[PDB]
Amino acid sequence: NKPIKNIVIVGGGTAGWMAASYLVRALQQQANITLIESAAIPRIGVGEATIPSLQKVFFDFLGIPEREWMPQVNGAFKAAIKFVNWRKSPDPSRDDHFYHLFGNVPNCDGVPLTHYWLRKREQGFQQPMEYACYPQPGALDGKLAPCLSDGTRQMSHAWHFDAHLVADFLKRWAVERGVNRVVDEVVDVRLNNRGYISNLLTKEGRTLEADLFIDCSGMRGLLINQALKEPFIDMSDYLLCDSAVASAVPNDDARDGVEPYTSSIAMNSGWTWKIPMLGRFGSGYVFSSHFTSRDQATADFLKLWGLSDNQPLNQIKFRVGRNKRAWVNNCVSIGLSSCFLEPLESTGIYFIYAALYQLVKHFPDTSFDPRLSDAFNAEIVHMFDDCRDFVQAHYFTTSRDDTPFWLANRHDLRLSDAIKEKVQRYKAGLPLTTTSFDDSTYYETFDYEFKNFWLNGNYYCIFAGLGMLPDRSLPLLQHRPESIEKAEAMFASIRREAERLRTSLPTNYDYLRSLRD
Amino acid sequence: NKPIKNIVIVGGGTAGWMAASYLVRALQQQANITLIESAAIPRIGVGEATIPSLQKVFFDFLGIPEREWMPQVNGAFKAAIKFVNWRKSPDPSRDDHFYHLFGNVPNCDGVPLTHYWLRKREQGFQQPMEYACYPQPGALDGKLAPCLSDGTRQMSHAWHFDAHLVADFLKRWAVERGVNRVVDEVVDVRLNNRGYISNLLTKEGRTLEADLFIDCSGMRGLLINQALKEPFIDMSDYLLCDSAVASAVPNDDARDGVEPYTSSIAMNSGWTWKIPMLGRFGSGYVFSSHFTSRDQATADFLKLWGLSDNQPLNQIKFRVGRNKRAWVNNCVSIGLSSCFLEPLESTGIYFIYAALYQLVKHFPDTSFDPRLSDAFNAEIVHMFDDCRDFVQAHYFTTSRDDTPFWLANRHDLRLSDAIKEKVQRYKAGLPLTTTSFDDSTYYETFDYEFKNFWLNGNYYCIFAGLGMLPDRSLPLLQHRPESIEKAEAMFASIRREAERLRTSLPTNYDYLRSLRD
Numbered sequence A, B: 001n002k003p004i005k006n007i008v009i010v011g012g013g014t015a016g017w018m019a020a021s022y023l024v025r026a027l028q029q030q031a032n033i034t035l036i037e038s039a040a041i042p043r044i045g046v047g048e049a050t051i052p053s054l055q056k057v058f059f060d061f062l063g064i065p066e067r068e069w070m071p072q073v074n075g076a077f078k079a080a081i082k083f084v085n086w087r088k089s090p091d092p093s094r095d096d097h098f099y100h101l102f103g104n105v106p107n108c109d110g111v112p113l114t115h116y117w118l119r120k121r122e123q124g125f126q127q128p129m130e131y132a133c134y135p136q137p138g139a140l141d142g143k144l145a146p147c148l149s150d151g152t153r154q155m156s157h158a159w160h161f162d163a164h165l166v167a168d169f170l171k172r173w174a175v176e177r178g179v180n181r182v183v184d185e186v187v188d189v190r191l192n193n194r195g196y197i198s199n200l201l202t203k204e205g206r207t208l209e210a211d212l213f214i215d216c217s218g219m220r221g222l223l224i225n226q227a228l229k230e231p232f233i234d235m236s237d238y239l240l241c242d243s244a245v246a247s248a249v250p251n252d253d254a255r256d257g258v259e260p261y262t263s264s265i266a267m268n269s270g271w272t273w274k275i276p277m278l279g280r281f282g283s284g285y286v287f288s289s290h291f292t293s294r295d296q297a298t299a300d301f302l303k304l305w306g307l308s309d310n311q312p313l314n315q316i317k318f319r320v321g322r323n324k325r326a327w328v329n330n331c332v333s334i335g336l337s338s339c340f341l342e343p344l345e346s347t348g349i350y351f352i353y354a355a356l357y358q359l360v361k362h363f364p365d366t367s368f369d370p371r372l373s374d375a376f377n378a379e380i381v382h383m384f385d386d387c388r389d390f391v392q393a394h395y396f397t398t399s400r401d402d403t404p405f406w407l408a409n410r411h412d413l414r415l416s417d418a419i420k421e422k423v424q425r426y427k428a429g430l431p432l433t434t435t436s437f438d439d440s441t442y443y444e445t446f447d448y449e450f451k452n453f454w455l456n457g458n459y460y461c462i463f464a465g466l467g468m469l470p471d472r473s474l475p476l477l478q479h480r481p482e483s484i485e486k487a488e489a490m491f492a493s494i495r496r497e498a499e500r501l502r503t504s505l506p507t508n509y510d511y512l513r514s515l516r517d
């Protein structure tokens, strides 16, 4: 079979430029890559929060160290997501926050520390789970950097940045390596009688042909949805939000610092993200138009930040779900053309490079063996549905009952069998997936992470933070007092490390300034 | 002169039965009215959107309160038309909607609030015009009823209903009051040598005579066009659409509510109406066969609602324009036999009862003084051409340039001097027609409304919603800072009222259910 020689990518957003740069890197020889992007159709870039695999799977693959790309996209550090007002009727007099941290909880004699923490809590211990089981949250409260001043990493972390600058950075990188860039707009897609894409007709009269087409056209799914008519599986029975009102807000970094984390602030009918960088934070009230008008959401959002009627707003809508198949015939959808999940756990750009990684793992020749795309499609389904369930798990486990939106989340969602099973194991007191690896190994072993994306620590951070605890601690632990004592020593180590970080890390603001102002 | 004694109405659609019932009411004494309608020729009833004058001019005249006719026609409430994707290249990621609301914008020291809104916008104010100047659009976004639960009206509104049931309701009403109903089909019309209608010959052998004939035969204009040969002024140089593909679509009212408004969803080569009622919405893609085939339009329409090849479709065509004269000799055309304009602003049934109102205002004796019909004809010309221009104003002011259809609308339409003049005044920053009345008074003073049908607020809703703003705010306002401050207080009142409506109105779905399931 003849190899894929010509590849056309439609779209110049994060997805398109990730596709171009990843493919130019992966396909060392025999690949002519052309990216077409409209000057008249905006890209989506709201100020984006990311996860550690962005470096390990994407930028390492390209050979670009963090210190190289990060200042060029005005990047800032993210060590967690902090959830605010998710636990109860929010009360202005009560500190209701919890973190979802990156990295693994240690095990003690084959049992995660989360489980020894729960046993302690049963005996009256008051410290919240993540403060007991992770060394860094206090440091995040102090707004400290994830690294010592000399760059030595001290916690697992990822990044906040404007996705426009990332696309820009990658456009530059990809074009210097031979990606052909066409600024133009596809207006028509011709399919042959078998349903394979033949060519694209552009507004300026170009006809584009390729062996393989990558649809990075964004939510419109120009190729996959509009031309190939792949059904989009609407998942608004799983997740209620379908909208956002977003903006960027100046930050007084010198008086207030830069939070080394994304915040998710629960609202009446959704939640608001906060994504700090130097000088500004991006923020969006993600909402369900079924429970609040865009009008009321906008008022709620402005009021949250003390913003004025003169404040500019980005009024976004989205459909939650994914294509029935990401790759149909000679077209692979990547990015918003493939799926969307609300940014509650920073998985959007993850879906782009994880899908690109999978595409190269299932790379076709010009015969397009359906066994390859079928395998690829099943990986994407698992990747997305798994994240959808984890995100959904933040909603149906809420104890908030103070609005129709929160009541509908408690009562009216459709739950996969897979999520119910996990919730059942959790409530029984069983660990979810645990690894013996350290973080370095986990984040270096993408075939493992991709299939074991949400571990025990991730579920515990969310479920325990939300106030849903297991019915009881692990029965095994009643037979293991020595193991319980060793766990105490591990809790004491973690506390030592927290205290060392407190006095050793530079502020996130100072460290960011030091790298590049 | 002998009075009109015998009146024959040809046609049993909305127009015929409105004519019968209006005339039986108006002509208290000396009137024998006969309506002939074919059992073999369908009526036009697609699910119809209406305006507040339907109650005030038509049903009040008959003495039928809203609460009486409305459940009998399975009516639902309409508080606006919402225009979707009319502003730009539609983008699935962007909320592009605006409302055209019923009712007046308040004035502040002789200047409409629209003008104070524009000055604010010049200074960076971001709220869309209709959300600033009207209290109800947020409530429509929340799908709320126009009335409190006890029926107290809270906004100006009209109705959605199947026009078949209205005809049915009025048939019953008119026959109980002495209208003679003949189910039969006119096959021939005899004119005397002077060109006056002598009699109608029916398929079943009846000969019908009358002093006055009302042509409600629909688009075929059996009497006015076919028998009297009155020229129809084709207006396809003004407006491009000549076709519709229509259907009814089930609605999940319990999960999705019932939108208290008509939607107009701009397509590639026209627009699609949505007209919600209980259990279903009527919908039609109105299109120009010059830019899209009926085939492609049908595919576009099915795709819009995720409908299947098994979905039933009503494939409509129409000619846009009006008779040179509505009333010729002893024949008055009323309804589709008289004129057609696409349903972009819900004027079809309006044309029926406004024309009937005018007919009674110009009512003849058997001498048929041409001065009466000449006056009547000039009123109809003004009524129709005025609406034609307002509808046309939605098209030529578009910023959409993404298809041939939208480009032709931007560049290729014939514009009346009257519409150019208005657009010129608008762009200069001048108010169009303003009233000092409240809505109640406007909607109660039909001689005023009929001549001042589209006010400043109506033009602003459309022009501002479409993104065509005046070159600058009213120069007068630079001399009136106190007036500007008073306008602020009025903007604050409107916001208070919006917020009160949000928490006080029942959902439109709940209120409709409560009245009659």
Ligand SMILES: Cc1cc2nc3c(=O)[nH]c(=O)nc-3n(C[C@H](O)[C@H](O)[C@H](O)COP(=O)(O)OP(=O)(O)OC[C@H]3O[C@@H](n4cnc5c(N)ncnc54)[C@H](O)[C@@H]3O)c2cc1C
Pocket: A010, A011, A012, A013, A014, A015, A016, A036, A037, A038, A039, A040, A041, A042, A043, A044, A045, A046, A047, A048, A049, A050, A163, A184, A185, A186, A187, A216, A217, A218, A219, A220, A222, A244, A284, A316, A318, A334, A335, A336, A337, A343, A346, A347, A348, A349, A350
């Ligand atoms: C509200 C919101 C919040 C988000 N938050 C996060 C977050 O915190 N973290 C994270 O990782 N991700 C987040 N995401 C996801 C992320 O922003 C996007 O997935 C990502 O930035 C790339 O989107 P895309 O490239 O698939 O599509 P787009 O950005 O929509 O780019 C589309 C491209 O296709 C081109 N195009 C479209 N049609 C044509 C055509 N006809 N001819 C030629 N070109 C065409 C456009 O010009 C553009 O270049 C968020 C997304 C949304 C909507």
Ligand SMILES: Cc1cc2nc3c(=O)[nH]c(=O)nc-3n(C[C@H](O)[C@H](O)[C@H](O)COP(=O)(O)OP(=O)(O)OC[C@H]3O[C@@H](n4cnc5c(N)ncnc54)[C@H](O)[C@@H]3O)c2cc1C
Pocket: B010, B011, B012, B013, B014, B015, B016, B036, B037, B038, B039, B040, B041, B042, B043, B044, B045, B046, B047, B048, B049, B050, B163, B184, B185, B186, B187, B216, B217, B218, B219, B220, B222, B244, B284, B316, B318, B334, B335, B336, B337, B343, B346, B347, B348, B349, B350
């Ligand atoms: C696509 C479309 C969308 C519309 N949307 C709206 C809307 O949203 N809001 C609104 O207010 N209006 C709307 N209208 C207009 C409205 O539907 C019609 O004007 C109205 O319902 C009445 O039409 P009519 O009675 O004049 O003619 P028809 O409904 O066509 O009725 C014709 C009658 O004449 C009879 N007839 C014809 N020839 C003979 C004959 N030879 N002998 C005996 N009887 C005969 C027929 O049997 C029938 O009874 C719309 C119209 C169309 C076409």
Ligand SMILES: N[C@@H](Cc1c[nH]c2c(Cl)cccc12)C(=O)O
Pocket: A051, A052, A053, A080, A081, A100, A101, A102, A103, A344, A345, A346, A347, A449, A452, A453, A454, A458
């Ligand atoms: N395997 C993923 C899990 C994850 C996705 N988003 C996260 C966030 Cl936002 C915080 C903590 C962990 C995650 C990771 O550790 O990066």
Ligand SMILES: N[C@@H](Cc1c[nH]c2c(Cl)cccc12)C(=O)O
Pocket: B051, B052, B053, B080, B081, B100, B101, B102, B103, B344, B345, B346, B347, B449, B452, B453, B454, B458
């Ligand atoms: N004088 C008319 C103007 C009008 C016709 N159609 C409309 C619609 Cl569909 C919305 C708002 C106003 C109108 C009215 O207010 O009813």
Ligand SMILES: [Cl-]
Pocket: A341, A342, A343, A344, A345, A346, A347, A348, A349
């Ligand atoms: Cl995301």
Ligand SMILES: [Cl-]
Pocket: B341, B342, B343, B344, B345, B346, B347, B348, B349
């Ligand atoms: Cl109409």
